[PDB]
Amino acid sequence: QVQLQESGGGLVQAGASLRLSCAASERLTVDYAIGWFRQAPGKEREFVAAISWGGGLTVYGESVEGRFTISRDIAKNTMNLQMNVLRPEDTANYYCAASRISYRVWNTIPYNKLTLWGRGTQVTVSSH
Amino acid sequence: MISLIAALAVDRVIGMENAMPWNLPADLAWFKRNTLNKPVIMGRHTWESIGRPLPGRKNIILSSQPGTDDRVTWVKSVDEAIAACGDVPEIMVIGGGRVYEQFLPKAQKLYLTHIDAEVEGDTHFPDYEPDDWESVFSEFHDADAQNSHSYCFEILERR
Ligand SMILES: Nc1nc(=O)c2nc(CNc3ccc(C(=O)N[C@@H](CCC(=O)O)C(=O)O)cc3)cnc2[nH]1
């Protein structure tokens, strides 16, 4: 299958920014959407952001709206999430996913209905 | 009676939500208004795009291959799809391309949203022959803060 390869995770202080990237190993078709979920220790996985591959239209989880921006480059077959004004509660393992499910539905879809997943990248935001 | 409902870009280009450049909550509301409490027939890629059943409608998926979700009704032919709808005043066919082509000759009504967007795509709504149809409703809307493009709702009835 197509592999989703994540990069960009790391440790930053509260208030800083961090840019995550997800590269798909094979070219995506216009009918796909690609996006990010995250899972903090002891918590359920939750939706972060998604972008439609053909349309380039976006949707965000309520807790990150305004602070995060998702984008994709067709030529390089890559998607990026620019995360600004980071808070300690943004600490989590971030997972890239792709699916034919409409991007607009990702904020409420059960995550296991998406069939393509990256393996997770750790983001840690410390007030120390 | 069988009806088709579709959103068409310039040159009748159609496609899945992820492929198309527009965001038209008003059109989604139009779709819901005109399909609620009616059975809907869709193809497998359209099912894959919606991700879960459309609420308040009987969901029927037309595919040659076995079903992979017991929440909805799976059928293998046009006739089986129609039978699955039972005795109702109106069956709504919701695409995509091949499904529209299969049901168009049986349809007596079209609900079309004409969107002012030029879109590259290989999939088109079937060539309906305009003189065979009567336009009975038309409503134009400009783009606004919520709706990315201008659009016109039209309903046609077969002569
Ligand atoms: N006029 C028209 N517009 C469309 O977008 C459309 N789309 C399809 C196929 N794809 C879709 C994709 C999403 C939804 C959908 O989400 N409908 C919701 C309304 C919005 C929402 O709550 O998310 C519904 O309950 O009908 C329906 C069909 C078929 N005919 C159409 N016809």
Side-chain angles (χ1 to χ4, degrees), chain A residues 2-75 77-127, chain B residues 1-119 121-126 128-159:
Chain A
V2 52
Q3 183 185 6
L4 301 180
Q5 295 190 93
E6 310 150 354
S7 60
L11 166 69
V12 295
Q13 77 274 25
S17 301
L18 196 59
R19 185 178 184 86
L20 305 184
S21 300
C22 181
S25 67
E26 306 177 1
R27 201 165 299 277
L28 295 173
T29 85
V30 292
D31 294 323
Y32 278 73
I34 190 172
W36 289 95
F37 286 74
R38 70 185 176 181
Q39 188 165 346
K43 294 194 192 187
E44 295 187 74
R45 190 173 299 194
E46 68 182 12
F47 173 68
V48 179
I51 185 163
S52 62
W53 195 255
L57 306 183
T58 61
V59 66
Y60 297 90
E62 285 183 324
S63 64
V64 303
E65 63 178 36
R67 293 187 297 132
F68 292 10
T69 302
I70 189 172
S71 61
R72 64 92 182 79
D73 188 72
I74 296 287
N77 208 49
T78 54
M79 170 267 287
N80 295 280
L81 182 68
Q82 181 64 39
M83 305 188 292
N84 307 304
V85 203
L86 283 163
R87 304 162 175 170
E89 62 267 30
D90 294 314
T91 297
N93 207 12
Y94 282 69
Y95 294 86
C96 177
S99 175
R100 297 186 65 108
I101 294 170
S102 167
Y103 79 101
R104 202 169 43 78
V105 181
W106 288 36
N107 54 356
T108 65
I109 199 70
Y111 76 84
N112 71 317
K113 301 302 181 177
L114 289 72
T115 55
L116 302 169
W117 286 92
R119 295 300 177 92
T121 187
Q122 182 64 38
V123 172
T124 303
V125 183
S126 191
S127 246
Chain B
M1 174 205 46
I2 293 166
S3 301
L4 276 52
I5 179 160
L8 275 56
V10 178
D11 286 336
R12 290 180 283 116
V13 174
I14 60 176
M16 302 293 114
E17 186 155 22
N18 283 333
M20 299 295 100
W22 60 77
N23 178 27
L24 303 178
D27 181 44
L28 295 186
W30 163 266
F31 175 89
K32 193 183 179 180
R33 169 178 166 90
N34 287 292
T35 59
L36 202 65
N37 302 130
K38 303 178 192 174
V40 294
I41 298 170
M42 72 193 84
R44 200 165 197 137
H45 290 327
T46 294
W47 166 247
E48 292 159 354
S49 173
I50 61 170
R52 60 158 56 100
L54 291 167
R57 285 146 279 189
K58 176 170 186 173
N59 287 230
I60 295 161
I61 323 304
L62 173 60
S63 174
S64 68
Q65 303 309 114
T68 51
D69 199 309
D70 54 30
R71 288 179 292 180
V72 298
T73 293
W74 297 82
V75 297
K76 292 199 171 70
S77 72
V78 165
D79 286 346
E80 203 191 338
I82 294 168
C85 293
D87 187 21
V88 300
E90 186 172 20
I91 297 173
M92 302 299 289
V93 175
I94 70 167
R98 178 160 186 254
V99 168
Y100 289 137
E101 292 165 357
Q102 293 172 289
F103 286 90
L104 175 65
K106 283 175 165 56
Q108 288 166 251
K109 202 155 170 178
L110 307 175
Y111 297 77
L112 307 177
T113 304
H114 301 284
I115 305 165
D116 295 311
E118 291 176 15
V119 183
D122 295 345
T123 316
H124 304 81
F125 193 78
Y128 56 102
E129 305 153 78
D131 289 341
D132 283 341
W133 298 84
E134 178 154 316
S135 182
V136 299
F137 179 85
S138 190
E139 189 183 271
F140 173 80
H141 297 271
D142 285 305
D144 57 29
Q146 290 74 33
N147 297 274
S148 61
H149 295 73
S150 54
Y151 53 99
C152 186
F153 298 131
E154 183 179 33
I155 298 172
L156 300 108
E157 294 178 2
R158 187 186 292 278
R159 293 175 185 271

